[PDB]
Amino acid sequence: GHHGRMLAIKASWDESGKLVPELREYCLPGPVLCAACGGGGRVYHSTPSDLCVVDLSRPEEGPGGLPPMLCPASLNICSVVSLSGGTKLLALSAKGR
Amino acid sequence: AESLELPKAIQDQLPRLQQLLKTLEEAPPVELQLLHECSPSQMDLLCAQLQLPQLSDLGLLRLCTWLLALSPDLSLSNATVLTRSLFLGRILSLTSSASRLLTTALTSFCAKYTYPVCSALLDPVLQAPGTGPAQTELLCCLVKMESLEPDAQVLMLGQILELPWKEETFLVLQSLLERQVEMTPEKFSVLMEKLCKTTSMAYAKLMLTVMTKYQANITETQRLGLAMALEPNTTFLRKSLKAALKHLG
Amino acid sequence: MAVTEASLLRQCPLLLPQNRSKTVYEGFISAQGRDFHLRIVLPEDLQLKNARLLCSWQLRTILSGYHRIVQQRMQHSPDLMSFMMELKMLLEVALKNRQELYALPPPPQFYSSLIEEIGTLGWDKLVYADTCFSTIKLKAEDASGREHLITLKLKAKYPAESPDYFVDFPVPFCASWTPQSSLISIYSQFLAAIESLKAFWDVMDEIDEKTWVLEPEKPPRSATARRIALGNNVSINIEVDPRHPTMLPECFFLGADHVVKPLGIKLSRNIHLWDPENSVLQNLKDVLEIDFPARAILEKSDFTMDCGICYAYQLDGTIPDQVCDNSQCGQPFHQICLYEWLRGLLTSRQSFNIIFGECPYCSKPITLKM
Amino acid sequence: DSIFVKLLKISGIILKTGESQNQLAVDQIAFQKKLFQTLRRHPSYPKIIEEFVSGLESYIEDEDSFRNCLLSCERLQSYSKSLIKLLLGIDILQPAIIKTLFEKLPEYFFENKNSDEINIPRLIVSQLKWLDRVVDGKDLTTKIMQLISIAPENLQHDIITSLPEILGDSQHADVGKELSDLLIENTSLTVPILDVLSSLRLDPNFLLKVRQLVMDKLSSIRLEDLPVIIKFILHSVTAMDTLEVISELREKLDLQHCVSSGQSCIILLFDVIKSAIRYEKTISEAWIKAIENTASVSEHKVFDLVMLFIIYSTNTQTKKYIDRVLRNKIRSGCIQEQ
Numbered sequence A: 001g002h003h004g005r006m007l008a009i010k011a012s013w014d015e016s017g018k019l020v021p022e023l024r025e026y027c028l029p030g031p032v033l034c035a036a037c038g039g040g041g042r043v044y045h046s047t048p049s050d051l052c053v054v055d056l057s058r059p060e061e062g063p064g065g066l067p068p069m070l071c072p073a074s075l076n077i078c079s080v081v082s083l084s085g086g087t088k089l090l091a092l093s094a095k096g097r
Numbered sequence B: 001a002e003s004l005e006l007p008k009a010i011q012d013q014l015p016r017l018q019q020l021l022k023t024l025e026e027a028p029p030v031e032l033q034l035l036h037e038c039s040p041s042q043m044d045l046l047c048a049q050l051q052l053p054q055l056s057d058l059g060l061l062r063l064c065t066w067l068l069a070l071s072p073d074l075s076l077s078n079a080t081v082l083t084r085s086l087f088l089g090r091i092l093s094l095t096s097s098a099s100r101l102l103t104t105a106l107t108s109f110c111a112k113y114t115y116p117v118c119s120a121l122l123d124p125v126l127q128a129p130g131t132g133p134a135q136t137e138l139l140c141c142l143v144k145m146e147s148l149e150p151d152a153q154v155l156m157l158g159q160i161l162e163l164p165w166k167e168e169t170f171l172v173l174q175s176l177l178e179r180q181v182e183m184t185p186e187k188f189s190v191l192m193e194k195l196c197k198t199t200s201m202a203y204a205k206l207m208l209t210v211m212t213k214y215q216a217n218i219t220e221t222q223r224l225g226l227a228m229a230l231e232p233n234t235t236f237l238r239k240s241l242k243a244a245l246k247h248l249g
Numbered sequence C: 001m002a003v004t005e006a007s008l009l010r011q012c013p014l015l016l017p018q019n020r021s022k023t024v025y026e027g028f029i030s031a032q033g034r035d036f037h038l039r040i041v042l043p044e045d046l047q048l049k050n051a052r053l054l055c056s057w058q059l060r061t062i063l064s065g066y067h068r069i070v071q072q073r074m075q076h077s078p079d080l081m082s083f084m085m086e087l088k089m090l091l092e093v094a095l096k097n098r099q100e101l102y103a104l105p106p107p108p109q110f111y112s113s114l115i116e117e118i119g120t121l122g123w124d125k126l127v128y129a130d131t132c133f134s135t136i137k138l139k140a141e142d143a144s145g146r147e148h149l150i151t152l153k154l155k156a157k158y159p160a161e162s163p164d165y166f167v168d169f170p171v172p173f174c175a176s177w178t179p180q181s182s183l184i185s186i187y188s189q190f191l192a193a194i195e196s197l198k199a200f201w202d203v204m205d206e207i208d209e210k211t212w213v214l215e216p217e218k219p220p221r222s223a224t225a226r227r228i229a230l231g232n233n234v235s236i237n238i239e240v241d242p243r244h245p246t247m248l249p250e251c252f253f254l255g256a257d258h259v260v261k262p263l264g265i266k267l268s269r270n271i272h273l274w275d276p277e278n279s280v281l282q283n284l285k286d287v288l289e290i291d292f293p294a295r296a297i298l299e300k301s302d303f304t305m306d307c308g309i310c311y312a313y314q315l316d317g318t319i320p321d322q323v324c325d326n327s328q329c330g331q332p333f334h335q336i337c338l339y340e341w342l343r344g345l346l347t348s349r350q351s352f353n354i355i356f357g358e359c360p361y362c363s364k365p366i367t368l369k370m
Numbered sequence D: 001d002s003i004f005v006k007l008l009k010i011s012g013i014i015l016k017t018g019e020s021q022n023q024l025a026v027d028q029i030a031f032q033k034k035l036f037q038t039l040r041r042h043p044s045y046p047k048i049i050e051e052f053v054s055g056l057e058s059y060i061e062d063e064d065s066f067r068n069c070l071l072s073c074e075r076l077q078s079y080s081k082s083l084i085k086l087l088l089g090i091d092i093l094q095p096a097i098i099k100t101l102f103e104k105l106p107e108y109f110f111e112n113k114n115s116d117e118i119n120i121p122r123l124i125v126s127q128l129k130w131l132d133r134v135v136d137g138k139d140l141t142t143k144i145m146q147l148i149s150i151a152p153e154n155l156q157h158d159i160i161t162s163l164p165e166i167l168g169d170s171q172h173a174d175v176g177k178e179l180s181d182l183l184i185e186n187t188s189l190t191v192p193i194l195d196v197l198s199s200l201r202l203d204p205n206f207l208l209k210v211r212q213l214v215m216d217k218l219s220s221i222r223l224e225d226l227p228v229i230i231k232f233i234l235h236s237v238t239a240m241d242t243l244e245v246i247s248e249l250r251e252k253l254d255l256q257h258c259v260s261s262g263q264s265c266i267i268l269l270f271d272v273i274k275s276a277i278r279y280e281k282t283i284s285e286a287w288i289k290a291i292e293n294t295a296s297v298s299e300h301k302v303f304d305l306v307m308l309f310i311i312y313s314t315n316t317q318t319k320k321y322i323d324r325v326l327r328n329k330i331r332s333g334c335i336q337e338q
């Protein structure tokens, strides 16, 4: 969602020994403008304040607690996974650059 | 008399069930999973029909262990119907303090299914006449178990408080309130109102213990109620009670 | 009440009959300081055999893999009353398992009062505060100039209840927590615990500098025992009393039984020449009439001081202690290894809880006392 | 500005604020006899003690003043007994002081471990230990028992434990009966009662009675307490009460019934039974003579086997006799797979 509802799904297979879908619904800060996925259970999303990141990687997660990258309002993000060294992403910052 | 049919699987496994109970006088089966197919109405015939009431000290105890393994939890009403065939006879029938087994068995069972257990049984044990030391000592142990979590001591409170107050209610209730069980002032006031309606040694100590732990919860108006409630000169330890009272003022 | 005219309202306040024939209830249900939507349509008669139960998509999330449980509950349940009792009991269960979604602090009490009490301490002290502000860690100094940390874990109401206080030093730490007590209270208590051990830390730091400490390796502040090495292939394990550290400790000897004998015998002669004015080392050197080597570690970096049965140091806490009474072997072993060796062989002969046998390497008489 | 503090100063003691141990201007004997004869010669001599104890009770309403009044006196010519202790040495004040001492103490249920981690309940009870005269036992009793009835666990547990130093010789047996009264009435406090009864001065007949009154409710007892229970049974056991208790013991005991903490204390029970039977041949001989006399029933139980293995493992003089009994039992078509 835009008003910062995030939906998380996973396979649980717990307590009955049968596959049950483990849902969260997170309510994250900020009107979310754009997001993308990076290597190792990481999502880069953006609010018109800040460009923030979310680690799902550890069933899954109680809260979805999140740092910025101190980058500005990037809308329309994109990711290329390098695996050379670290991950290298491409953005359009809100001002038009 | 009533013309009720047990589920056809229970009428079928009714003698396998009668086998298994007998077995438990000498990890659980599927036969115990068929109780989920009983309504409390059919279950009521079924408790009487398994003749759970005559199980040994040993026999009952092993059993209780099995019901507590069950994965879909037993419905409020169903869980209660059970209690009254399982224990309530023996509890009422108690003369000398309950077997370590029935304490254990009851307490362990009470540990999972405490609201159905205690929502059912507490009232009648106490709404029975000729309730003696033998009966109280296990409802003493009920409240005193670590397992009886705060939330459940609160639910115990909603129940202990809805009963007519006599000496038997107070002694158990002091020991629930002895933890510092959390109170909405809604219930604390009623406890205090109810407390404030009286000659008794039990009640003396009850009031005293409230006013040390829930000093914190004592309003001006509740301290007036306590001034009212301490009026008596039959009150033993009055100096203590009024010293504690005056110390709030 | 008995009737669900009144018992329904008294147990589910937030269930409002829309239709005249009390057939559509709607509105809410309460659940662990959390109200949720509900829209619960009955048939033209009061029957739950057929009933529509629709929800918030929020409610579908929390009734994850109980869809069938509650479908059972609808068909087997007598009344709507009883259904709601169960649906509450059931939500409480679902959420207490999913208990990792909860807990908002009281900001007018907490964040400020915590900033206030840390100001009371001083800002030079604080070393760590968690981004949930749940954990913090604080620093104090000894009179010696040693850093001693304290971890705190905080509740939603810090000043009301005790914060969980975790700290390394060996005697059990006691914090007189009142709702009136603060970070400064427990900090003074922490300094009190530091100074009762002030002589103790000095005796331990002295031993750790001047002697070949063996069997705590980077010891914490919690260690009261200190396995010192002396010469090679004999050791002394030393437990010290923290309140009387300079005073005589219980001490005893590991190694070859021909090497331990004169040392024990000279300790028994010279134990009255212990004096608590000197250090532990300055009393042991004149009691046992020896010096200690300074870290035969760096020269003897591979002397194979391993079991020589299993070829490992540290088998399940145990150390190479059992040795050969021989100048030419001197090979250490473990209790478990030497026992599973000497019991397995024919030749081995046991008195009561002792085995006499042959040393594996040199085939000389070796004794094991379990 | 009270007759209490005034007449204390007259009789030759310094009554301090309450922050360090109270000084004493005269000898303790001199103080006590002077305070006695000064209250004697005062007009309204029977009525001065009411005013005396009213002044005292109003004085000791602060914690710390009272606590310093309970603590060791400073001796100028160098420690001594407390001001309340030296008052208690005076017999005419004594019953009144008991009355007061017992009246207020439930204030200190929940204020245990104040300032220097000292229990004012233990202080106020330790004012009654080794008293060289007691005027009234029965008053003292009925109040101590009513206190015991209501009070939470460790407090009363401690009173129980301290009862042997407190009580005079006339009032042993009395207490005995009413403790057996408490025994049936509460289980939790089985242990210290027992310890007490065995550290009292009583008649052995009564002890037989209570021991049976153990034995009947022994299914109701949580396991933790059993060892010291059964230790008590096997020190109360005579040479002549051997098979009696043992047959009864051997019956009532279950060890199917008890079952992670259960297993550990079962083991520790067996340690304790080992030490019992290890440690008197009286039991071993008669124990066996009580298992051979159960060759009748095919139904003799897990305990009888495990117990045999035990007496063979521990007791040495009997090895032939165990083997003899086991062989004459096992041939008979008794002990088998099941």
Ligand SMILES: [Zn+2]
Binding pocket: C307, C309, C310, C311, C312, C315, C333, C334, C337
């Ligand atoms: Zn080894």
Ligand SMILES: [Zn+2]
Binding pocket: C324, C325, C326, C329, C330, C331, C359, C360, C361, C362, C363, C364
């Ligand atoms: Zn060798």
